[PDB]
Ligand binder design. Structure first.
Ligand code: KNH
Ligand code: OLC
Ligand code: OLC
Ligand code: OLC
Ligand code: OLC
Ligand code: OLC
Ligand code: OLC
Ligand code: OLC
Ligand code: OLC
Ligand code: ZN
Ligand code: ZN
Length: 164
């Protein structure tokens, strides 16, 4: 065969699709809804409630926009470095890095523009009394799950031969 080093076209489409979907949903919630309003999509399981977060996960480190600014630039540059140096010929890793990149960039735009993050996903399917999050948060969590899956799987991949 002819194996490929960088699935760059797929990785860009993935990141572009997530950031567009994240920014549009954030905009229409902040435009067509007041804070505290709640709409019902799946009763008792999923609602859309306008919410604002000036901090990180679970509202930790609230009001530290300079810290979020620096640490997100470090993350974005680190993801680009690992894409080129350690993820070549690995489509699974390149997809996970793109989801991490899109998620970090999505929340980074909100903090730079407004100094806070719009959150509207209000559900209990992934656990009860779970904080209200957004699409950028979902992409981040998803990419982290794939990263730990790939590396945990390769702990059991130490087998000498590669051909029958
Ligand atoms: C999830 C990415 C968090 C995201 O970090 C970001 O921005 C990126 C750029 C990096 C941060 C600046 C650095 C913090 C370290 C990560 C952290 O904090 C602990 C890790 C727990 C987490 C990962 C395994 C699982 C569960 C959390 C949540 C559930 O996610 C579905 C939180 C959803 C609601 O708290 C919602 O209000 C959050 C709000 O939207 C702002 N978003 C952020 O801060
Ligand atoms: C989220 C899904 C985003 C859509 C990502 C799929 C794009 C794609 O796979 O296109 C591959 C094609 O070969 C172009 O390089
Ligand atoms: C999650 C989205 C899954 C992305 C898969 C896209 C894909 O399969 O692209 C193949 C590539 O274009 C050729 O090998
Ligand atoms: C970020 C996306 C920038 C476009 C991708 C790119 O830089 O293309 C690499 C080119 O092939 C280098 O020779
Ligand atoms: C909150 C997360 C903050 C920073 C994560 C950034 C992680 C950056 C880790 C850099 C370590 C590194 O690059 O090591 C080189 C490696 O050995 C070459 O393959
Ligand atoms: C919580 C934020 C994530 C914790 C820091 C990520 C761990 C990390 O930096 O990984 C480096 C990479 O694995 C080097 O090969
Ligand atoms: C938790 C939500 C906040 C977001 C925090 C994101 C921080 C992640 C930073 C870099 C990840 C880059 C992943 C690079 C994966 C490649 C690992 C690798 O190749 O290392 C091989 C080594 O030999 C095996 O130990
Ligand atoms: C979910 C959709 C899965 C699509 C995966 C396609 C794919 O992985 O392409 C293989 C590549 O050509 C070689 O690694
Ligand atoms: C938003 C735009 C790009 C996000 C892409 C995020 C995934 C990081 C891709 C890193 C990259 O640019 O790869 C260049 C490589 O040289 C290719 O040939
Ligand atoms: Zn009912
Ligand atoms: Zn909050």
């Amino acid at each position: 065969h002819m194996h490929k080093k960088y699935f760059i076209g797929t990785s860009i489409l993935i990141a572009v699709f997530v950031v567009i979907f994240d920014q549009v949903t954030k905009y229409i919630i902040a435009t067509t809804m007041k804070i505290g309003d709640s709409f019902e999509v799946i009763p008792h399981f999923l609602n859309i409630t306008s919410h604002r977060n000036n901090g990180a996960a679970w509202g930790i480190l609230s009001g530290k926009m300079t810290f979020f600014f620096i640490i997100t630039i470090i993350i974005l540059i680190a993801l680009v470095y690992f894409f080129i140096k350690d993820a070549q010929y690995n489509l699974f890793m390149q997809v996970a890095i793109s989801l991490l990149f899109a998620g970090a960039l999505g929340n980074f735009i909100d903090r730079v523009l407004t100094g806070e993050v719009v959150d509207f996903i209000d559900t209990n399917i992934f656990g009860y009394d779970f904080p209200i999050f957004n699409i950028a948060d979902s992409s981040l969590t998803i990419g982290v799950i794939l990263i730990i899956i790939a590396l945990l799987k390769d702990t059991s991949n130490k087998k000498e031969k590669e051909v029958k």
